[PDB]
Write a protein that binds this DNA or RNA. Structure first.
Ligand SMILES: [Mg+2]
Ligand SMILES: [Mg+2]
Ligand SMILES: [Mg+2]
Ligand SMILES: [Mg+2]
Ligand SMILES: [Mg+2]
Ligand SMILES: [Mg+2]
Ligand SMILES: [Mg+2]
Ligand SMILES: [Mg+2]
Ligand SMILES: [Mg+2]
Ligand SMILES: [Mg+2]
Ligand SMILES: [Mg+2]
Ligand SMILES: [Mg+2]
Ligand SMILES: [Mg+2]
Ligand SMILES: [Mg+2]
Ligand SMILES: [Mg+2]
Ligand SMILES: [Mg+2]
Ligand SMILES: [Mg+2]
Ligand SMILES: [Mg+2]
Ligand SMILES: [Mg+2]
Ligand SMILES: [Mg+2]
Ligand SMILES: [Mg+2]
Ligand SMILES: [Mg+2]
Ligand SMILES: [Mg+2]
Ligand SMILES: [Mg+2]
Ligand SMILES: [Mg+2]
Ligand SMILES: [Mg+2]
Ligand SMILES: [Mg+2]
Ligand SMILES: [Mg+2]
Lengths: 137, 101, 52, 112, 116
RNA sequence: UCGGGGCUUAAGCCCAGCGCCGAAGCUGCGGGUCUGGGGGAUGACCCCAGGCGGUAGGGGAGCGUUCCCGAUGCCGAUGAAG
RNA sequence: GGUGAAAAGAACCCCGGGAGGGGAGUGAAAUAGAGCCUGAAACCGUGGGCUUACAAGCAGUCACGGCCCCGCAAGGGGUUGU
């Protein structure tokens, strides 16, 4: 009968965003979020690392995105459309562009969201240093 | 010490002395089949070719038997078709004796 | 018997749930100066009477 | 040791007494009497009465000590309803279930 | 001779109410019961066929997640092993990886080598 | 809104290639049943091969309910039916 | 339509205006107590176990896990978090 993990301490990580293609970056951050580089993987469980990102504001993005790419945010009401172009995003709270794109590669359940909570993002660095932080790439 | 024997369609990690059930066998009520099928070991037996050559594992047919019945039942809608079936799968029981590859 | 009507029998659950705010709270009683008796505050209550 | 008392076939509706009974579940008898007393509901005058007798037997029947008995458990059960017709407008006629209860309290000596 | 229903149907009913035990609200009291059981049947038979692909999957992820530590694809790791001639890793038992990793790590160079 | 996230010497398009994933398909191991072949003089049971999605519908074998023969019997208060 | 073999139909005390109960008593049995044999289901309730207030649902199923329970264990039962 297949092995099954017991409780474990959560590994943390640190990433530098500068120069990273936003998506290509998200992908990994995602695959980390699910305990999915670990070989004792377990779906129903949430033993993902605790990815911490810094220098978000610097995220490279190809093509015309900045100008061209629009962020839809539907309020509840008549004409709650709300389109926000990629720049205005970074220009004001920019952590989002990254957040707003890991949430995206995370699966959908309560677990997915448990995970979105492990991920912690700042444009900085200067994240609350605490302990772990093993930088990556 | 580790050893991966392949009995009855499927393969199992196997220890010096442990009970394990497997796809039914033709063996006596209580005799000794050696699972001439073996792969790996507690210290890298390592099965270069499919099977490991000068190797094997002894086991005792503890006693055949059959399992908790399952209800395989089928139903297509709009169409008056229901089929209920009983199906307990048979399973012979093993005490692993000699790990001796 | 007419125009608007319940579309489905409400369930034991849904029913009992609506009922959740139904429970009553016990009276408010206080002992009187006079007897060891129990009164709703600011009342008078028989078998005890009152002064002034 | 328990002291049971049941008054059955009372002509109040279950859903409606249950409320009062709920008021005194697991309360000190001296406590209940006070609650049942100043509760605003036709419901009490029955649960009272049945509670009061619950005590009586507790005492003139099981030596149990008044000053130390409490409503261990109590409940009410639906007994058979009295169906009545009710001529209703435009000829159609309705039937009214005048429902009915079996109220039950049971006392216990507190502790030791 | 008249054969009234009698016991018969009561009994056939109970039979099912049993199976239907623990189902939500009304589905454990009737013939909503049956309707439910009906689907349950199909669901399991269908899920018993799934439970296969279910693990196949879980296993792979587990391996691929492993031999990526030794830097490579399940897609090639598995490849070597075919070349390697080793039927050994029935994906089930590449839960080596989890315990007794040595044998895996060994199994790695083994196909690495097998590669070229 | 391209299923979405997201993608730009790509995660797009064209050309060539090696891998792996991937169904209830095919294999492996076990088991049903039926049809055929064989053992067996035989019945018996055993082995080998193959068929076994299905509405209208045709065919087969069964299960249970009431009653009758079996009952001037048998079970039944040490407990019938339900 | 049906207490029980027999009315032996529950004296008497207790709470209550009564009803109805609690004791006492009869009976093999009184959840056989009087529209009383048996007493199923829907339906209402009381107590206990597991569970639930960031969560998306034909209500199940497959898996793992936690808790509770039966067994010395291997095991099983209940519940349901993902
Ligand atoms: Mg359908
Ligand atoms: Mg309820
Ligand atoms: Mg009117
Ligand atoms: Mg009229
Ligand atoms: Mg009929
Ligand atoms: Mg459940
Ligand atoms: Mg096949
Ligand atoms: Mg086969
Ligand atoms: Mg046979
Ligand atoms: Mg066949
Ligand atoms: Mg076919
Ligand atoms: Mg067919
Ligand atoms: Mg066909
Ligand atoms: Mg008859
Ligand atoms: Mg008995
Ligand atoms: Mg009389
Ligand atoms: Mg009496
Ligand atoms: Mg006297
Ligand atoms: Mg009067
Ligand atoms: Mg009378
Ligand atoms: Mg009897
Ligand atoms: Mg009884
Ligand atoms: Mg009466
Ligand atoms: Mg009556
Ligand atoms: Mg009943
Ligand atoms: Mg319990
Ligand atoms: Mg919660
Ligand atoms: Mg339990």
């Amino acid at each position: 009968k297949t092995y099954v993990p017991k409780q474990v301490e959560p590994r943390w990580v640190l990433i530098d965003a500068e120069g990273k293609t936003l998506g290509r970056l998200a992908t990994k951050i995602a695959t980390l979020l699910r305990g999915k580089h670990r070989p004792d993987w377990t779906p129903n469980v949430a033993m993902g690392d605790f990815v911490v990102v810094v220098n978000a504001d610097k995220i490279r993005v190809t093509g015309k995105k900045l100008e061209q790419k629009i962020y839809t945010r539907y309020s509840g009401y008549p004409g709650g459309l709300k389109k926000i172009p990629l720049e205005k995003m970074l220009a004001t709270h920019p952590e989002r562009v990254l957040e707003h794109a890991v949430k995206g590669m995370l699966p959908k359940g309560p677990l997915g969201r448990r995970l979105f909570k492990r991920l912690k993002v700042y444009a900085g660095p200067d994240h609350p240093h605490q302990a772990q932080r093993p930088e990556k790439l | 010490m580790f050893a991966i024997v392949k009995t009855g369609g499927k393969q199992y990690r196997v220890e010096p002395g442990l009970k394990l059930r497997v796809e039914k066998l033709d063996a006596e009520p209580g005799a000794t089949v050696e699972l001439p099928v073996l792969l790996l070991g507690g210290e890298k037996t390592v099965v270069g070719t499919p099977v490991v050559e000068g190797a094997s594992v002894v086991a005792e047919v503890l006693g055949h038997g059959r399992g908790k019945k399952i209800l395989v039942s089928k139903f297509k809608a709009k169409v008056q078709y229901r089929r209920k079936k009983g199906h307990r799968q048979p399973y012979t029981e093993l005490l692993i004796k000699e790990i001796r590859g | 018997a007419k125009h608007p009507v319940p579309k489905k029998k409400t369930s034991k659950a849904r029913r009992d749930a609506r009922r959740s705010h139904h429970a009553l709270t016990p009276p408010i009683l206080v002992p009187c100066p006079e007897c060891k008796a129990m009164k709703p505050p600011h009342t008078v209550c028989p078998e005890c009477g009152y002064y002034a | 040791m328990e002291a049971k008392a049941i008054a059955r076939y009372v002509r109040i509706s279950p859903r409606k007494v249950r409320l009062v009974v709920d008021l005194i579940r697991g309360k000190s008898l001296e406590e209940a009497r006070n609650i049942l007393r100043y509760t605003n509901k036709r419901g009490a005058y029955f649960v009272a009465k049945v509670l009061e007798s619950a005590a009586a037997n507790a005492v003139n029947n099981h030596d149990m000590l008044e000053d130390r008995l409490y409503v261990k458990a109590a409940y009410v059960d639906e007994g058979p309803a009295l169906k009545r017709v009710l001529p209703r407008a435009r000829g159609r006629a309705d039937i009214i279930k005048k429902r009915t209860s079996h109220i039950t309290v049971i006392l216990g000596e507190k502790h030791g | 001779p008249r054969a009234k229903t009698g016991v018969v149907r009561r009994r056939k009913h109970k039979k099912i109410l049993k199976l239907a035990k623990g189902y939500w609200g009304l589905r454990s009291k009737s013939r909503k019961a049956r309707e439910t059981l009906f689907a349950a049947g199909n669901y399991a038979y269908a899920h018993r066929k799934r439970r296969k692909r279910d693990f196949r999957r879980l296993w792979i992820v587990r391996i691929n997640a492993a031999c990526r530590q030794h830097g490579l694809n399940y897609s090639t790791f598995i490849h070597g092993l075919k070349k390697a001639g080793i039927e050994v890793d029935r994906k089930n038992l590449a839960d080596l990886a989890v315990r007794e990793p040595q044998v895996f790590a060994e199994l790695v160079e083994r196909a690495k080598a097998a590669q070229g």
